[PDB]
């Protein structure tokens, strides 16, 4: 359900306001910690000796009300990036005072206006307050989708980049605040919206609140406020990002008792999938749709391997490499029933903790049809030659987790007429901008290792708070069985991705596509996502220092898959528009061990 709040700059008494506010159903109140007209002097005599209390005392509300029901506001008279020395230094001190009272109160969050082009000083005052032991607070920088210098009316006797610079205000803020997790954006909407190509970027930010003026709401024929469709789409995306919606302004629909504006959010939040339902909650490396497509593939093979009159006499030899707990063996068996064909099966797992489970299956359900091998597929001196080798040694990135080195190792007991399942798989890459995934990468900073090695290692993730810059391109192709002698899985690849708009690059996202057998495909590529398959999430490859890109350029990225008899690893580097150090050289941060 939607969460929402009220932006009141006038608060005569807090229990009166919070009393009537909560009755209208708002979850929280954004209010200022000091009166916004009450200018204060600190450097200048004689005003700095002002008697009396500087604000309403914190005793008026219980500590639970402050920490949950309230959000702060920075006073509008504060221009810490003003050019005038005396207006600046008084404004640095007031901000510390209104923020430290934000700490002393225990407020969950604080609103800070970003509307100027230069906000270098404002960040310093906020960089000095984070490093004070005040972690119970958040900063919601108030930045609009469209600047005030563009939303205005052109009714002046002079003529009235220019659409994206609302973001560059922000990226130059967090970059000055070292991409702190304690800084978020409250995105101020207005009646004029940018193109969707920008919105798709803004949702890559940590949008944590959305400020909705009442002046965008139209009036329907029933007299109730509504949003035109170009807004309702954007709000449907914001709801998916779980932001909190703030109703700024006042009742223009003066008859309707201001709570009507909130009622429509509680309408849109209802009237708008299983991958998002199953997914919830970065990690360093019960899906029957994924196993059925293995089953249908085996069915489509056995009919193709076995003529109809050899059904009773053709002993089809399957080797289920990486059987694990044996779901692929139930499938390999169910296909035979579905195909009505004789199969003999060697289920191979090394892990004794699972051989215990397969061996129990053999005695309870499968019978003598299923052989189990306890030695590993690279050691086992097998007695007979497989007609098929079936497997999921795959990973989120297909050539990860040693599916090739194991299958091409288990190829010396495959018939020359034989096939392999998955027979082909090809991994896919695209650049992504994600300021939230990048901070969740830095959050992995771990003691007793090189503090930048967390960027030289991938992370599995349900990509949710991310923007994608280009259609994914195939990086690495593998087809099994290898029809050739020596030639090696050590591979080199280069990819060039076009770019449309100014945006940071924080990594490249891994997907994959696999041909189990002809016209049967598991896939998590977005443009060809398999239905209802969610076992394999994408992966994230971070980079040491983010890359800020200009439109019209190309992102040229080089990946290597390199290996020896001991280790297997990846290396990756961005070289256009700018050179990024070759990541994970010699497996110093990441390996998938043979």
């Amino acid at each position: 359900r939607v969460s929402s709040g009220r932006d009141l700059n006038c608060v005569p008494e807090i229990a009166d306001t919070l009393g009537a506010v909560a009755k209208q159903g708002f979850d929280f109140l954004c209010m200022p910690v000091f009166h916004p007209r009450f200018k204060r002097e600190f450097i200048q005599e004689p005003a700095k000796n002002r008697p009396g209390p500087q604000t309403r005392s914190d005793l008026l509300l219980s500590g639970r009300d402050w920490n949950t029901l309230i959000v702060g506001k920075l006073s509008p008279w504060i221009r810490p990036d003003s050019k005038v020395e005396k207006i600046r230094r008084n404004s640095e001190a007031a901000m510390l005072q209104e923020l430290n009272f934000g700490a002393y109160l225990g407020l969950p969050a604080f609103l800070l206006p970003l509307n100027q082009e230069d906000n270098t000083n404002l960040a310093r005052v906020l960089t000095n307050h984070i490093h004070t032991g005040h972690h119970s607070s958040m900063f919601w920088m108030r930045v609009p989708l469209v600047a005030p210098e563009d939303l205005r009316d052109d009714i002046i006797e002079n003529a009235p980049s220019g659409e994206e610079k609302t973001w560059m205000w922000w990226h130059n803020f967090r970059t000055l605040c070292d991409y702190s997790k304690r800084i978020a954006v409250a995105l101020e909407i207005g009646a004029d919206l940018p193109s969707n190509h920008v919105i798709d970027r803004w949702l890559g930010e940590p949008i944590k609140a959305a400020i909705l003026p009442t002046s965008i709401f139209l009036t329907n024929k029933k007299g109730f406020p509504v949003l035109s469709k170009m807004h309702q789409r954007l709000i449907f995306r914001l709801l998916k990002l779980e932001v909190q919606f703030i109703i700024t302004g006042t009742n223009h629909h003066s008859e309707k008792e201001f709570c009507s504006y909130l009622q429509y959010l509680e309408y849109l939040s209802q009237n708008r999938n299983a991958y998002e339902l199953f997914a919830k909650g970065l990690q360093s490396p019960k899906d029957p749709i994924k196993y059925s497509q293995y089953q249908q593939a085996i069915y489509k093979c056995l009919l193709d391997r076995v003529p109809e009159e050899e059904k009773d006499t053709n002993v089809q030899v399957l080797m289920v490499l990486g059987a694990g707990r044996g779901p692929l063996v139930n499938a390999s068996l169910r296909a035979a029933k579905q195909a009505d064909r004789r199969i003999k099966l060697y289920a191979v797992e090394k892990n004794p903790n699972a051989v215990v489970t397969l061996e129990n299956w053999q005695f309870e359900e499968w019978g003598s049809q299923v052989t189990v091998v306890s030695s590993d597929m690279r050691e086992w001196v097998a007695p007979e030659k497989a007609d098929i080798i079936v497997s999921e040694l795959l990973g989120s990135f297909a050539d990860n987790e040693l599916s090739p080195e194991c299958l091409d190792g288990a190829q010396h007991f495959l018939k020359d007429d034989g096939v392999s399942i998955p027979g082909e798989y090809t991994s896919f890459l695209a650049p992504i901008s994600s300021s939230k995934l990048y901070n969740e990468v830095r959050a992995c900073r771990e003691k007793d290792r090189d503090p930048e090695a967390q960027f030289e290692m991938p992370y599995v993730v349900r990509l949710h708070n991310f923007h994608q810059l280009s259609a994914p391109q195939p990086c690495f192709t593998f087809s099994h069985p290898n029809r050739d002698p020596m030639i090696d899985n050590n591979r080199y690849c280069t990819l060039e991705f076009p770019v449309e708009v100014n945006t940071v690059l924080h990594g490249f996202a891994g997907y994959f596509e696999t041909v189990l057998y002809q016209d049967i495909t598991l896939s998590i590529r977005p443009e060809t996502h398999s239905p209802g398959m969610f076992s394999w999430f994408p992966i994230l490859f971070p980079i040491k220092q983010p890359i800020t890109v200009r439109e019209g350029q190309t992102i040229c990225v080089r990946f290597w898959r390199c290996s020896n008899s001991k280790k297997v690893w990846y290396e990756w580097a961005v070289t256009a528009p700018v050179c990024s150090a070759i990541h994970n050289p010699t497996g110093r941060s990441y390996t998938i061990g043979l």
Partner: protein, 301 residues
């Protein structure tokens, strides 16, 4: 009547019979509500018991002005413009209306020269124009890019008012035209005053304390009067008027057409908020501040 008043006095406005009007607000404390106080005697102020009439508001008071004689117009903290009538004997104050037509604080309010219409500048960037007799807004011009700090209705032409904002713009407005606003010529503008006789020429004050005289047809004759933000520029009722200037420097400087300083009062302990020359003694200037003092300065002329 209200038993108490607030410390931080924000506005002072005489009328023709010399009666003094104060707007007072709580810029601190538990309740940021505010109050209007009418004094037949400017010297009886600020004591509550010596007033003639006054009333509490359900929200702050940022600015006020006189609509005719039996009425007051009020800029509220609540994003609303309130018109308050006086009683028959002017011992009581009554709401002509209260209307919430701003998404943020009503920073300043001025009345157009005919007295029927009013202009309410604001921090919610849109300036608006009010019809006081119909009690409804006719126009809403969102021309600026920031907080409209101050405005000034023309003293001769009803359709004309000024506006300035933190975007450094200084705009002349004419609500008869199809694109009403036009720009007048680095420090930001804080307050404006039309010259009551040279209706086409005005003065402005900026945050750096410089004071200027600039014509509509044009240029910056100016002087560095104050050290800090010039909150208000006010013109005396003389034939040859004297330009009062009051600042956040807690000082009051009074000027003439040459912009040279004739008088300086550092008697205020805090920000001087407003100044209004008395009609019964043109040498007498009354001020108010957040230090709660009500001061009457007599100026050598």
């Amino acid at each position: 009547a209200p038993a108490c008043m607030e410390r931080q006095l924000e506005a002072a406005r005489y009328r023709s019979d010399g009666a003094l009007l104060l707007g007072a607000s709580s810029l601190s404390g538990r309740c940021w509500a505010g109050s209007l106080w009418l004094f037949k005697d400017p010297c009886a102020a600020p004591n509550e018991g010596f007033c003639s009439a006054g009333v509490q508001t359900e929200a702050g008071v940022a600015d006020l002005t006189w609509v005719g004689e039996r009425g007051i117009l009020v800029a509220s903290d609540s994003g609303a413009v309130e018109l308050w009538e006086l009683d028959e004997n002017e011992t009581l104050i009554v709401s002509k209306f209260c209307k919430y037509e701003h998404d943020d604080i009503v920073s300043t309010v001025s009345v157009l020269s005919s007295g029927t219409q009013a202009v309410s500048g604001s921090k919610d960037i849109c300036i608006k124009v009010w019809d006081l007799a119909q009690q409804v807004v006719l126009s809403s011009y969102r021309a600026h890019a920031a907080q409209v700090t101050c405005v000034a209705a023309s003293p001769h032409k009803d359709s004309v008012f000024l506006s300035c904002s933190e975007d450094n713009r200084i705009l002349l407005w004419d609500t008869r035209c199809p694109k009403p606003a036009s720009q007048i010529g680095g420090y930001l503008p804080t307050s404006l005053a039309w010259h009551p006789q040279q209706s086409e020429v005005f003065v402005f004050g900026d945050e750096n304390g410089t004071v200027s005289l600039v014509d509509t047809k044009s240029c910056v004759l100016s002087s560095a009067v104050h050290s800090q933000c010039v909150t208000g520029l006010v013109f005396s009722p003389h034939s040859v008027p004297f330009l009062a200037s009051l600042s956040e420097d807690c000082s009051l400087a009074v000027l003439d057409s040459s912009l040279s300083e004739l008088f300086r009062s550092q008697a205020h302990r805090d920000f001087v908020r407003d100044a209004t020359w008395s009609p019964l003694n043109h040498s007498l200037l009354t001020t108010v501040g957040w230090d709660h003092q009500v001061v009457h300065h007599v100026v050598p002329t």
